[model samples]
Target: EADCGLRPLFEKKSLEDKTERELLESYIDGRIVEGSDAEIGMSPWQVMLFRKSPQELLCGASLISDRWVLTAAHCLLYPPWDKNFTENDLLVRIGKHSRTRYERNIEKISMLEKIYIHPRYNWRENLDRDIALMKLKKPVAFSDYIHPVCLPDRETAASLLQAGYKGRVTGWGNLKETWTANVGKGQPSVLQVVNLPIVERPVCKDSTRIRITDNMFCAGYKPDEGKRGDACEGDAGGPFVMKSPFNNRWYQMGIVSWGEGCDRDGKYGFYTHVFRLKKWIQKVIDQFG
Candidate 1:
């Protein structure tokens, strides 16, 4: 989980005076909006979409290929009726950044002909296999900032600390949305970045109260004065990237799964460890054949 930075100091005014986008910019270091604001350089293939409805704005998604996207199952699930929701309700757009509406060539968009949900997923608990592959109607064109990230191996994942995998987590969620029926209303989600150290198994399991299941791993620190910022609710389905700074490549270390209400003490967020289920992923990919 990653937390956005707070309002910058050296100002005499209150933080409430700043707009949502402004506060986000103050904390996000080098973060930028997909299209309208183009200050940052996040890879394109590492991006995808999370749409609310046919005409609603969608969240960003990462591309695994021209035909498939690896995203959180929750991204497709309607908050009120997750289990029974239809995959058709979700529209996937790849190689896009701007929030504005636009049409791609007939071959650019990949509407999912099939949504492969893990049979073992527990929607209520948000447990393992909380992922799905969106089979695009057509393949996406890859370019700079638009490439797939490698899947980490078990050995590499387990040795996250030793491997020196510097984790980079980004999200388009807010630190706090207004408390009202329109919870997300007036809140514009922006991509935010925070670099955190990977927590080892024993350290992760022993630290948090919930059972640190085998399928998951922990990152970030509880948002206290001295700890790292964590990913929050709106950040669900986001990627936690492990970078090989030397060669400039990255691996999708985990899929931002869930955390204990965002920024609780000793309860940072946990992601589904991609390394532990590489075979399952490969098998699914092969199924496309």
Candidate 2:
């Protein structure tokens, strides 16, 4: 049975409290530690798109298979003004801990064989259908710190993304000092994480009246809950993941697309809901299979 959204008989105290933490850890190994660096195996499916020129990582991705990577469509077209992308333009780094400093053989760097953007993707308009997949030049060998994340059966995914349910967004997110301080002076060497809960649609609309499309979904703590918005900028094309309460396996649920910014009251991070794009995604993967 889908046990993801069950309510607790007892009221919660600290998340660190034994009972609270046990329930959490049973599903999610390390409950998304807000804005913290991750251990190497913490996010085995994490992939960073390494663009050569202008040398920082452009976006994040999830290794969905030995040869396929999932990411936001816009990530492949980024540095938007110029819009020239080639297979050679980016390298996929998986099983990475520190983005800058690395150990040989511990991480795998694969070249791109193909880039598949959703046919309905509207990069010019509302940026709808932002899902994308990349084919690696060579399939990767699985390791303790390098593996793929699961794409669950539709019902299992629905259980995790239900309103008020918890999900985690991990990436090599950029840094901004204090929500009030407009400091963009640093980037991360370590991969980062942020935890947010799926909020009710009306509550999501309460944050911003902007174009929240049917293909999109929102997650984050409300302002009254003390500001836990945004998944940071670099995470924009990364995986918005959830751990299945039933099977205890992590599943990729959303692709980070855009947001209203972080740590603000009512402001939330919006995503390209992967479940909504299921048919198209299955078709694409099947073509390769």
Candidate 3:
């Protein structure tokens, strides 16, 4: 009944099957390979959450509607000591490619109507159930470069995340990989792209040295073999999208939550299991819409 995840410019290519490794300082913002710059409309649903100010800051989000976006709940807690970010002071930019470019018609900007973080979201507790939705004061117009992504049902997301399936993460997070927690350097000026394959629970938990619960999932490379820079310190709240076999349309399976390090050897990025929280998302949408 709706149009979503329609990328007219993306030419679906047969991904190569390989059994090797390459070394480079790639960032989709980290261990991602080259060809990181995303062409226009390649990821139409990607949202850049910019807090308007003299020097604006940003977060990643997924467009769910002309007026709503889905993102990580913990995005509100960065600079944890300085708790000044409020719901009213928010901006959502759709169809945007360059982070610093000054193009007018190329992007659509909207202000926040309300910000809804899950009632159970606990920022201090391992980012549990980390998801949030942003409603815009005025709905933006949809175009080839602006659209929503399909939200997967529980079984659909589960099957995709449970298997060794590859999915893509798009954001302007890290431009170079780093081991420390400092996330301020080498950020990309343009949107970045990286595709990651899901990793097993116990296997990834042992590798990334993080706790994995049912509400969260792991994906990326281990050691020298992986889509290491699939995400980095700054790529929170963006969609972890997979193509559905039934329709070949991309479905958002998860949101970037946290990772131990930026493409650290044998490490993986953890994403919020989005579909587990879909009931709440739908409830919010139905109530608000």
Best model per TM-score: 3
Which scores greater on TM-score, model 1 or model 3?
Answer: 3
Backbone atom clashes (below 3 Å) for every candidate: 20, 1, 5
The per-residue C-alpha lDDT of model 1 at residue 2 equals 14
Model 3 agreement with the true structure over 174-218: per-residue lDDT tens digits: 313323455555667787776666888888667654567788988
**Candidate 3 lDDT trough over 10 residues, lowest sum:** 17-26
Residue-level lDDT of model 1, residues 1-289, one tens digit each, is 0111111220112323222233222223333221122223343444545443655534445566556677666556545543343556656654443434453431135566677666566555546666666677666555433455556556556544332234666655422231123354444333455555466678777776666677787765533434434454234666776543333345677787754444335345577777666676778878773
Residue 256 displacement in candidate 2 (angstroms): 0.6
How far does residue 12 in candidate 1 sit from its true spot (Å)?
A: 43
For candidate 3, the TM-score is 0.84
Candidate 3 at residue 86, lDDT?
74
Q: Kindly list the per-residue Cα lDDT of model 2 for residues 143-252, writing each as its tens digit.
A: 76677778767797667778867777777763132132454546667876666678788877667856678888887765654443346633667888776657556688
Model 2: runs farther than 4 Å from truth?
1-33, 78-80, 174-181, 227-230, 260-266
lDDT of prediction 3: 0.71
**Cα-based TM-score, every candidate:** 0.69, 0.82, 0.84
